[PDB]
Design a protein. Structure first.
Length: 46
């Protein structure tokens, strides 16, 4: 029993606003958490 665009459009309504809210807030924050997490907890190691 296929759909159209009303059950799931609610998901395609708050996601488009999501993008604007944190478009540029992605690279900045990551750079702080990019170098810390390769020493402390040690994803890999011996």
């Amino acid at each position: 029993s296929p759909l159209g665009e009303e059950m799931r459009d609610r998901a395609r309504a708050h996601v488009d606003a999501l993008r604007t809210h944190l478009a540029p807030y992605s690279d900045e924050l990551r750079q702080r958490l990019a170098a810390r997490l390769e020493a402390l907890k040690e994803n890999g190691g011996a």
